[PDB]
Amino acid sequence: TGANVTFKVKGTDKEFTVFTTRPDTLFGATFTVLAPEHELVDAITSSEQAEAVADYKHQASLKSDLVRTDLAKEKTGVWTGAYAINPVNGKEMPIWIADYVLASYGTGAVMAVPAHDQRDWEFAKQFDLPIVEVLEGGNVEEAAYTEDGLHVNSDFLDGLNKEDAIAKIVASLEEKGCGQEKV
């Protein structure tokens, strides 16, 4: 009961898809995270980042899934040198690779919404990435707010609930060809 969302890689011919349960949190997506093992990684890595990205892929391949998805472990990762385009507002989002995302978790790609996902939150805090609230009810600078609330900072989604916003966002994307609901 989710949605596939497609992100273009800025300045290239490349794209990747993320599967998300919460397409309505799209305006809160401040970066994207690919599993170190994702197919796209080598293609979009900048020449400056290439060596750190290779050391990081090596290090992550030395860790089991269970270790990598252990919430208590320090968050770890490296910037690819590339940016993704948010299909709803064209904003640029850095593309990082990180342990905590597995190649088998969905598409191996997540749109990170640190304000409302604990793992993304901890990664954003670790790496000083921006945190933007889109569901009201919490204090996202101090703790991820992982519950439902009315939308804010979300343009045409402002004031709606989960069911409503999911409907509108999905329509907006299917019409553009940048998304679609998947089961």
Place of tokens 């890689």: 9
Indicate the residue type of 54. Answer: A
In SS3 terms, 77-114 reads as CEEEEEEEECCCCCCEEEEEECCCCCCCCCCCEEEECC
Place of tokens 């269970």: 66
Residue 157: give its domain's CATH number.
3.90.740.10
Q: Resolution in A for the shown PDB structure?
A: 2.5
- Residues 148, 21, 133, 171, Cα dihedral to 10°: -100
Which residues have a Cβ under 8 Å from the Cβ of 128 and sit 6 or more positions away? none
The DSSP bridge partners found for residue 94 are 83
Domain that holds residue 122: 1-183
- Residues 27, 31, 37, 41, Cα dihedral to 10°: 110
Six-digit token string for 109: 């790609």
How many distinct structural domains can be found in the chain? 1
Calpha distance 169→183 (Å, rounded): 17
The DSSP bridge partners found for residue 96 are 33, 79
Do the beta carbons of residue 96 and residue 48 sit within 8 Å? no
DSSP 8-state code for residue 151: B
How was this model experimentally determined? Answer: X-ray
Residue 105: name the closest of 43, 37, 178, 53 by CA: 37
- Number of other CB atoms surrounding residue 120 within 10 Å: 27
